[PDB]
Amino acid sequence: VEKQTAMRRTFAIISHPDAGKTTLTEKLLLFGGAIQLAGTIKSRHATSDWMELEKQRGISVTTSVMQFPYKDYLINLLDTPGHADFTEDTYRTLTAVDSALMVIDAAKGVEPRTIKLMEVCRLRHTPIMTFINKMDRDTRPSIELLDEIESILRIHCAPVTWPIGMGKYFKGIYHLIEDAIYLYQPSERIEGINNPELDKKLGDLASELRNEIELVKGASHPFEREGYLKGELTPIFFGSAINNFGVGELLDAFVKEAPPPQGRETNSRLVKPEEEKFSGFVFKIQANMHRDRIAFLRIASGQYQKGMKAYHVRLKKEIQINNALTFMAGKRENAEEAWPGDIIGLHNHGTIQIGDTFTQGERFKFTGIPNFASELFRLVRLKDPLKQKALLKGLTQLSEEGATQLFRPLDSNELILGAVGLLQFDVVAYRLENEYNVKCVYESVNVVTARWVICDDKAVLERFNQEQSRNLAYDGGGHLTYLAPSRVNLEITMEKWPEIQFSETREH
Amino acid sequence: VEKQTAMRRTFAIISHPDAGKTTLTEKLLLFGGAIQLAGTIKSRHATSDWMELEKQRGISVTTSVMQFPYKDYLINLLDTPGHADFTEDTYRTLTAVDSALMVIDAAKGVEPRTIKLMEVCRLRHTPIMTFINKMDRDTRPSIELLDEIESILRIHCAPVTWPIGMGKYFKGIYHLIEDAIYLYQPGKHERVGESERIEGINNPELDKKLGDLASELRNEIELVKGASHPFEREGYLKGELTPIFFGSAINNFGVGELLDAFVKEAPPPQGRETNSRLVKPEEEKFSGFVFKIQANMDGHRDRIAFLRIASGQYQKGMKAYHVRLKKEIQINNALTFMAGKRENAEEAWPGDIIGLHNHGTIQIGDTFTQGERFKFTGIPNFASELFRLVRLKDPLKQKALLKGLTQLSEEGATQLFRPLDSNELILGAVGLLQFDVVAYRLENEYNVKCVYESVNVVTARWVICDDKAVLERFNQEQSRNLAYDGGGHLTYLAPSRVNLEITMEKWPEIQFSETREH
Amino acid sequence: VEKQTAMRRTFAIISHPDAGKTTLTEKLLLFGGAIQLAGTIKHATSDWMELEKQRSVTTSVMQFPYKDYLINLLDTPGHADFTEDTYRTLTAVDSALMVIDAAKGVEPRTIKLMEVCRLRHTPIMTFINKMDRDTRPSIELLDEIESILRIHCAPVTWPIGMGKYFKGIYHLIEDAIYLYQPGSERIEGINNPELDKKLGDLASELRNEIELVKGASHPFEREGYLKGELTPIFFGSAINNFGVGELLDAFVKEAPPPQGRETNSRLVKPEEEKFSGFVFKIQANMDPGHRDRIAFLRIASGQYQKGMKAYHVRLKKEIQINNALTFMAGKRENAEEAWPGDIIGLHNHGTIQIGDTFTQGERFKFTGIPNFASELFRLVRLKDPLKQKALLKGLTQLSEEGATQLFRPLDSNELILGAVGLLQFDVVAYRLENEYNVKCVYESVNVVTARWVICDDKAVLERFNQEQSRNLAYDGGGHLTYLAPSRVNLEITMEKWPEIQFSETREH
Amino acid sequence: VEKQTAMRRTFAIISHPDAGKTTLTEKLLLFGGAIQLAGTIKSRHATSDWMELEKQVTTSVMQFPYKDYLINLLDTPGHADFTEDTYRTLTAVDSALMVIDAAKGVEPRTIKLMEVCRLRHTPIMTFINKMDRDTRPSIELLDEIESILRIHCAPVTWPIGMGKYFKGIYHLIEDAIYLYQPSERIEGINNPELDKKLGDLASELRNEIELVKGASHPFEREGYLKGELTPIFFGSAINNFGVGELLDAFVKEAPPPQGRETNSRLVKPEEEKFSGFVFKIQANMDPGHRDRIAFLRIASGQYQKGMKAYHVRLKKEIQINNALTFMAGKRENAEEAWPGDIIGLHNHGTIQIGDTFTQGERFKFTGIPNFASELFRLVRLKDPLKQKALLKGLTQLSEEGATQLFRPLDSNELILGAVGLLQFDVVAYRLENEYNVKCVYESVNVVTARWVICDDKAVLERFNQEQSRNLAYDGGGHLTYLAPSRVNLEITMEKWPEIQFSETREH
Numbered sequence A: 001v002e003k004q005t006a007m008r009r010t011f012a013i014i015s016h017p018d019a020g021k022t023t024l025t026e027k028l029l030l031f032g033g034a035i036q037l038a039g040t041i042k043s044r045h046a047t048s049d050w051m052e053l054e055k056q057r058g059i060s061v062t063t064s065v066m067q068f069p070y071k072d073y074l075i076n077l078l079d080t081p082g083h084a085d086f087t088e089d090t091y092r093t094l095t096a097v098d099s100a101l102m103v104i105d106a107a108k109g110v111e112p113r114t115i116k117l118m119e120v121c122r123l124r125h126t127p128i129m130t131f132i133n134k135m136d137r138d139t140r141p142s143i144e145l146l147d148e149i150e151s152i153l154r155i156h157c158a159p160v161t162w163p164i165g166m167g168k169y170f171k172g173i174y175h176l177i178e179d180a181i182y183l184y185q186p187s188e189r190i191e192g193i194n195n196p197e198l199d200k201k202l203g204d205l206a207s208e209l210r211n212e213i214e215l216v217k218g219a220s221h222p223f224e225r226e227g228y229l230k231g232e233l234t235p236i237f238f239g240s241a242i243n244n245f246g247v248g249e250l251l252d253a254f255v256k257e258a259p260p261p262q263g264r265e266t267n268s269r270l271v272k273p274e275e276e277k278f279s280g281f282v283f284k285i286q287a288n289m290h291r292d293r294i295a296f297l298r299i300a301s302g303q304y305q306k307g308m309k310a311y312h313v314r315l316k317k318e319i320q321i322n323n324a325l326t327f328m329a330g331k332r333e334n335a336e337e338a339w340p341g342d343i344i345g346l347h348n349h350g351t352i353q354i355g356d357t358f359t360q361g362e363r364f365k366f367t368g369i370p371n372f373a374s375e376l377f378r379l380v381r382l383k384d385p386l387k388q389k390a391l392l393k394g395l396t397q398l399s400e401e402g403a404t405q406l407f408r409p410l411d412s413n414e415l416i417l418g419a420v421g422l423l424q425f426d427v428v429a430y431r432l433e434n435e436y437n438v439k440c441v442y443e444s445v446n447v448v449t450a451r452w453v454i455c456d457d458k459a460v461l462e463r464f465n466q467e468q469s470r471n472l473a474y475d476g477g478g479h480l481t482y483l484a485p486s487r488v489n490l491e492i493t494m495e496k497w498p499e500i501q502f503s504e505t506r507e508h
Numbered sequence B: 001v002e003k004q005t006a007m008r009r010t011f012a013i014i015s016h017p018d019a020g021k022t023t024l025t026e027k028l029l030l031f032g033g034a035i036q037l038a039g040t041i042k043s044r045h046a047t048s049d050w051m052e053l054e055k056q057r058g059i060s061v062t063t064s065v066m067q068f069p070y071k072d073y074l075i076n077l078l079d080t081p082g083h084a085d086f087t088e089d090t091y092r093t094l095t096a097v098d099s100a101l102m103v104i105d106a107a108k109g110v111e112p113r114t115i116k117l118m119e120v121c122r123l124r125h126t127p128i129m130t131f132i133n134k135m136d137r138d139t140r141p142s143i144e145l146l147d148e149i150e151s152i153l154r155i156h157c158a159p160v161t162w163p164i165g166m167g168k169y170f171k172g173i174y175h176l177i178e179d180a181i182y183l184y185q186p187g188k189h190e191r192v193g194e195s196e197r198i199e200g201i202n203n204p205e206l207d208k209k210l211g212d213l214a215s216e217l218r219n220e221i222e223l224v225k226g227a228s229h230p231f232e233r234e235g236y237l238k239g240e241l242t243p244i245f246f247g248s249a250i251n252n253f254g255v256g257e258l259l260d261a262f263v264k265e266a267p268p269p270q271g272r273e274t275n276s277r278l279v280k281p282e283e284e285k286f287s288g289f290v291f292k293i294q295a296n297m298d299g300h301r302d303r304i305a306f307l308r309i310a311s312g313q314y315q316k317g318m319k320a321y322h323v324r325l326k327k328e329i330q331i332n333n334a335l336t337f338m339a340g341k342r343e344n345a346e347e348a349w350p351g352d353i354i355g356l357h358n359h360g361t362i363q364i365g366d367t368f369t370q371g372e373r374f375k376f377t378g379i380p381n382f383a384s385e386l387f388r389l390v391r392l393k394d395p396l397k398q399k400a401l402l403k404g405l406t407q408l409s410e411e412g413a414t415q416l417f418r419p420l421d422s423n424e425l426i427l428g429a430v431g432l433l434q435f436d437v438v439a440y441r442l443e444n445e446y447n448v449k450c451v452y453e454s455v456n457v458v459t460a461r462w463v464i465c466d467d468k469a470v471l472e473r474f475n476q477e478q479s480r481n482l483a484y485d486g487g488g489h490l491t492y493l494a495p496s497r498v499n500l501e502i503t504m505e506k507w508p509e510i511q512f513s514e515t516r517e518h
Numbered sequence C: 001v002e003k004q005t006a007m008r009r010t011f012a013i014i015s016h017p018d019a020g021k022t023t024l025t026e027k028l029l030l031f032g033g034a035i036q037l038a039g040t041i042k043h044a045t046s047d048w049m050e051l052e053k054q055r056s057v058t059t060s061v062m063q064f065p066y067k068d069y070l071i072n073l074l075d076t077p078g079h080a081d082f083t084e085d086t087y088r089t090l091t092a093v094d095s096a097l098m099v100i101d102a103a104k105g106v107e108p109r110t111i112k113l114m115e116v117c118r119l120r121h122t123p124i125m126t127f128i129n130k131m132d133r134d135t136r137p138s139i140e141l142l143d144e145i146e147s148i149l150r151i152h153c154a155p156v157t158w159p160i161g162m163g164k165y166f167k168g169i170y171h172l173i174e175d176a177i178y179l180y181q182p183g184s185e186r187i188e189g190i191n192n193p194e195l196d197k198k199l200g201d202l203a204s205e206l207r208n209e210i211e212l213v214k215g216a217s218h219p220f221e222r223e224g225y226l227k228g229e230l231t232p233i234f235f236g237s238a239i240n241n242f243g244v245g246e247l248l249d250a251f252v253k254e255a256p257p258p259q260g261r262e263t264n265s266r267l268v269k270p271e272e273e274k275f276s277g278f279v280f281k282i283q284a285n286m287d288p289g290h291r292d293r294i295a296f297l298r299i300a301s302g303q304y305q306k307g308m309k310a311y312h313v314r315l316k317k318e319i320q321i322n323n324a325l326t327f328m329a330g331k332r333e334n335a336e337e338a339w340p341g342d343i344i345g346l347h348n349h350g351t352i353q354i355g356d357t358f359t360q361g362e363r364f365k366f367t368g369i370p371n372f373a374s375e376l377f378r379l380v381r382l383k384d385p386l387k388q389k390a391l392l393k394g395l396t397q398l399s400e401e402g403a404t405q406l407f408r409p410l411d412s413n414e415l416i417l418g419a420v421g422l423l424q425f426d427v428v429a430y431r432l433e434n435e436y437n438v439k440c441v442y443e444s445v446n447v448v449t450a451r452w453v454i455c456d457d458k459a460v461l462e463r464f465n466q467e468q469s470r471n472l473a474y475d476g477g478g479h480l481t482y483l484a485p486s487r488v489n490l491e492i493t494m495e496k497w498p499e500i501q502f503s504e505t506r507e508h
Numbered sequence D: 001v002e003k004q005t006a007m008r009r010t011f012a013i014i015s016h017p018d019a020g021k022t023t024l025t026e027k028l029l030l031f032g033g034a035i036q037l038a039g040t041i042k043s044r045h046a047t048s049d050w051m052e053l054e055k056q057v058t059t060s061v062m063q064f065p066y067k068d069y070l071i072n073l074l075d076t077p078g079h080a081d082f083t084e085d086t087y088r089t090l091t092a093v094d095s096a097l098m099v100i101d102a103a104k105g106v107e108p109r110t111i112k113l114m115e116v117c118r119l120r121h122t123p124i125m126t127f128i129n130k131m132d133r134d135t136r137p138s139i140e141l142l143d144e145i146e147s148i149l150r151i152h153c154a155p156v157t158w159p160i161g162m163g164k165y166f167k168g169i170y171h172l173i174e175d176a177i178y179l180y181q182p183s184e185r186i187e188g189i190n191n192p193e194l195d196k197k198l199g200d201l202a203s204e205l206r207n208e209i210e211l212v213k214g215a216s217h218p219f220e221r222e223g224y225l226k227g228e229l230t231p232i233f234f235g236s237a238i239n240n241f242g243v244g245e246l247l248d249a250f251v252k253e254a255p256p257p258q259g260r261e262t263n264s265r266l267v268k269p270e271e272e273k274f275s276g277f278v279f280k281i282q283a284n285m286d287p288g289h290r291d292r293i294a295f296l297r298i299a300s301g302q303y304q305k306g307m308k309a310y311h312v313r314l315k316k317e318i319q320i321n322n323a324l325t326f327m328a329g330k331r332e333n334a335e336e337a338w339p340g341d342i343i344g345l346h347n348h349g350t351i352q353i354g355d356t357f358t359q360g361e362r363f364k365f366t367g368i369p370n371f372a373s374e375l376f377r378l379v380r381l382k383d384p385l386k387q388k389a390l391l392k393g394l395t396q397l398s399e400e401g402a403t404q405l406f407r408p409l410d411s412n413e414l415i416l417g418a419v420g421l422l423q424f425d426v427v428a429y430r431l432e433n434e435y436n437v438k439c440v441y442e443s444v445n446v447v448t449a450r451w452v453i454c455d456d457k458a459v460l461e462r463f464n465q466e467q468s469r470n471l472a473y474d475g476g477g478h479l480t481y482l483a484p485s486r487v488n489l490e491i492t493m494e495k496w497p498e499i500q501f502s503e504t505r506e507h
């Protein structure tokens, strides 16, 4: 039962849209023998478009988690949708990984989502490996790309591979550890950075490689396990994903260095995966676009066995998991068992919520499962006023399943919806109609961001509430929330109240 | 003369690549009856690909500036290449405009180049009109787009038009000043006059045509009225406020509204400061300044120096005074830029750009008058964003390399740095293409083959300090990271962002600038 | 019982005299801790006889431990005590270690001993000795081995410089450099910059030569080594104990454990529970009046146990083995047991002959135990024909004990002795006198070489005999033998009679 | 990979000649669909005749589909081509089907093949054949099977009448009657419809079924799989009657490919890595040729046409490019194979009986047996100069299971031991064709053989001294008693009760 966890590697790719996530995912799948999934994923929208396919077909349930073997390792790749189906779940999914793979477009460097996803990873000091993609086209200087990562993303860079040329004159990569050159020939290998054959085939590029490698080892850091595991250092790899080049070097360093499933804290103790008793937590729910839903559970300890009895901690109730969805690529049936690090899909009809902890009787709740500051806001109401209670009931449940956040402004009876991605508004409106027979209408509001408000000094907090009530609300969890009409307003308010904490995350 | 000036509008579009500048340019050209030209720019790349194309056709300089009539106005649009042909010239072109038109991809909002080009504009408080493009596709929420502009770009937003719907349900725009709705109806925006217009935001006809979009509009406009500013000419002319327009350039929608407000509100040619007096465009005597130089790639060794007319009148074949060379020259056949022209014009006016032919006697920042000696100020260098050591395979060609690099620097082709503690030569560029142009020029004009090497430099700042005791002290601790540029200005070459910060905090009495007067 | 076989390594050193066998042997004993033995190890046959009379058998076999292995090194005397026993000893090994003088290359005995090993396709490991002095070019040495010895060379270590500028060796499999610093500094990586700092130009020449070797040579592959088609090459200086360790570690790792042997019927495997073995060498006591002899037996299967009953197949009766000579270094007395691969010395007085098979009852005879073409020939007669009977009785016995070969021409009445080594004549002369009170005299004969004649076609053979009987003889075992007056005569006869097989060896 | 093993049923038919094996095989092939193959075996000598034809293989194994099942039927030649290979084959099956001639009951071959099956406690199912002719009483047949074949009988079908008045069979489990009409089904043994059609036979059925209740056993799975109990079926193979019921119970109850012990550990079929073992070798008789086929049972992993295999005994990597497959109706050899299947390994004398194959892991499967020789002949040459060749030939022949070889302690003579008379012909021919030696046979005073085992070296040495005239070592170096008579073996075994005289030994 020790080797089942030992061989496992659970992770996700963080990247700004168009960096190369999908392209890389395909290649890694090819290395895993998953020729099936590989083609399927590349065979891939407005939010509306996603909903159309979603209803009729909606086979986005079988690829939210991609499990595949490589060497003597089992790799769990969790999906982080970034386009039409970007939602808060994209952030929350990172809570269920043990490390992350960051993809950067060499021509772009660090982008807005790169920063956001890193901030999320930063919540658990999640180890990061970096693939600098698209070397086959012109790029920013490699040193510049690295420097920016260190300054903006606040993490030391440690090159493991390095580009030879760029764009039209991209001739391959140099593995700093192997001291070998892999030639890019749309894979001849050459040992020794000083090997005279390099100068013969690559010319001036050969001495440029030597030049750059020297600059690197003077202004940069060498790879280091400890720093990497503490999230203070990231090994960098350069390649061209579309040409499946540099990927193999990345994957080998990944399985070798990336962490196996780690333990997680609870409201009582540290749970380690090697414990014989089963346990896990729910971090994502998606409903059938029917009334059944699938709650994605990361196993935290013990083992899962089909048809087993488990303890639903919140509901103080024993349950039986009869046919939990598993994610082995190419499988025909659900696996009979699963292990720590793995994800399983729990079928239900509304009895499972975000953060739900499952055990075998022991009553604890896993911590660290976050809500994230909403980025998009809308007022929600009905045309038929006689349906208010069902609207609230629906929104509450939806809030509990992480589909949306819900805000009740102090000075009114209005309801405000908070979303991280545009699709959530579509999913809410549909689910409300289908599951609650409630027809809702959206309106624009003057809110652009949100912060949770925290002050242990109740006299200060009370003066704050009195003054800022127009911009205050309670969310679905009862937490005081500041809904800023503008970034500038947020700045002024925060500056006006240095005694009050304004947070971008909170525990669900 | 004063009438010639009054009808002119000289501007450039500022935007991040892919935002829609080329598309908007096409549509503006069509409004100006420049059908042929619109077609050409529309039929538009690694830096190497650009180099090839340039060598083959070499007519990227005749469209560097696009002049076209609209109503009783004459419009001068200076291009700001943002793709393969991005270079320092892209920043410096902004010194030659009287206002700017910012284009934003509504699905993207404010991007890195948007920010950078706004910084350049800020140097002169250049007035900004804003166009939010791509409404025909899903966008970020309108109110959010505006907040990011005010927050990131430090300028008040003043909606003049406003979107009705978005993406698949984008149905038109409301004009806040006209109180009128222009319906978006593909197939009716090819020729002017065929589109449907509705009077009044509370007009019942709206609810008929657009349904729930009508009440959403009414709601959003009230939010905007309460949290936004109304358009105000003074704030606009001061560069503190930007009127916002929304549309879909590819479908020629919302463009007419933008163009009409532009010609109405955008400033005509303005006075330009000098080392002494202020020069006003209405003055009788001709004068101007050179703000960029483009070399003929095709055994040619002629170049075009782009000059903005600051006052008076250019006449083909006129005598003029080259202030730097303290010499009289003749201007026999300067390039002009009227769309669809058969030949260069006989005259040009303030706000206009003309192209002066020369073989290296004209440099960036050069002032030309009719006798008066003064130099226009405010023509900037901008901090280089790319760095490379340059050297030779043959030591015997050092003199030619230096001569070439010195001329190229003086023509703005590149920046040139000489570290204090070495004899090495470092080239500084804003755009990747500059290194290609420099290498080609060195070979073709100076018969010198240069070799580039990466160097440990990511950014640079010009160093200024009143107290010379502190400064000279500073030149001791940091000489290894110091250099003199081609103008003899002390420059700090930061190996990293962190190093710059750390050096700057240690020396707060020392100013570190990202721009300097050329 | 199986473990005991797996840990054993039985081998012999094959080499031309003065190549460095004694020196390398000394160093190998040192690695095994046989300090004393290494010391003892370190003219004419007349002198060797004297030392043998005055005072060998205890060191004919050298057994010593090394790590978790037990090594049996069988001696192959090449100086004054060289005899046919030197050849026949190789039939009792499972592999061989060839030592070559880097200054000499392939020499006459190198060729003969390889020919003997080739009989059983004996696996060969090669040590190129004397790197501390000038040598023949390394590429030359290997080509001579491949061309002359008909075996592929697979470099495993490679020399750095030579003679005065000998700096050490490169291990191709470890990619590590061992510095020869005569007072064991190891440098990792052939492209490691520390190499150029310490070895200067020799580093680049090394990398050049390794490239040449890669291209025109073979990498080690054990199937080929074990088949006798490929020999791993090691370089060093035995006198300086340099490069010996690498060889030894590869030896115990790659060299085969005791293997099964064929018999006149079934194949016999070492792991079988029953004891069995064969006699490959015999040595008599040179003491006047004594009849003591030691029959060297290799154990083919089962376990030797002191005082055991064994079956003497030729004599078809049961005997007892009370105090068999054993060969552990530094031993005090003969071991109480021994296992497959080991040699033991059977005490007797003439009842044990070359080829004798011993079992625990089963009736079979091991095959492949060879006679080798004699290289020296002499007529043997008496001054006084009085004891002619005793002479013939002695020569017969000596021939059966491998001390000499005996030929009796088809057409005449002379007795002709054949020897591989000069010493044999001295031992025969001395043994006849001391054991058969016969004084023999030798006479030169016009014979330079011998070949056993084989032909299944009686008519052809009779035709052959009618023309060549003058050159034909029966040997001691009744085998037809051609005695050539000259090399040319043999070539002419062989070319005239291609239907007839002329062999340089036969089954004893 | 899991269902691959679970869908396979590998067995063999055990019976005395003339019982009905050939006929039942045909019927089984029919249910499967292999009409052609079935029609072939129907076209069915002395050893002399067989040797003739065999000069001028693919039906040694008969693989065929039935529902969700794949059936591997290993043949067990009982007539002219009966040899030791016939016994050794059974080591390659996971269960067996016993066919008995109703008029005869348990016959000599029946007993021998059951003894072989017993070596592995091989599950047995039984088919009492030829109900259409007069028979021994059914209770008598069951009784004989019990005491003689030491296995409890568990009827699943039962005959109604016999000879002239065979009217059908009764299915004790289903409680249904299938009528024999040269296939009407009736339910309830006490169904009044039986009496109407069959008459007094209806009461006789009820009577006998009740008799079976108290004196016989009910089919018990665990017991059957343990080899302690065999389900009994009745019918007439010539009329394809009662056959269907046997097949269905077979595919349902018969065990899937089981694991096999080795010198190192128990190897399971489910294992990823490919492994197998040779239990039979067939030589091409055609003159000049030197090719053989080594039949290999797959114990684990999977066979892939063109895979790399590890020849354990030779410590050598080999390549299996075109291994013979035995799917009925096949156009070419199969690209893959799974545990329980048999494939043919082409070679020229480098593969031997007992040979294990893996993918690098060096171990050797166990339980592959040698069986006591039943026929004996002295072998010699008229040309004494070929003694070496004879021995080399005979040794090789011995390792390929073509014969056993014995060397008596008190002479230099060579005795061959065979199970089937054909082996002598095959050996004489092979010695000639492959070793160019002409052997001569002479009768010997030996009728049977037992392997001598005894851990008491004190007793063993005296035994050897006293009985040396009847002792020899075989081709594996095992001490063997060669009895001049049955009575001699009985006495000898009584005078030495501390010595084990076995009829089998691991090869």
Ligand SMILES: [Ca+2]
Pocket (backbone or CB within 6 Å): A397, A400
């Ligand atoms: Ca609930």
Ligand SMILES: [Ca+2]
Pocket (backbone or CB within 6 Å): B360, B407, B410
């Ligand atoms: Ca100049």
Ligand SMILES: [Ca+2]
Pocket (backbone or CB within 6 Å): C350, C397, C400
């Ligand atoms: Ca004798």
Ligand SMILES: [Ca+2]
Pocket (backbone or CB within 6 Å): D349, D396, D399
């Ligand atoms: Ca063999």
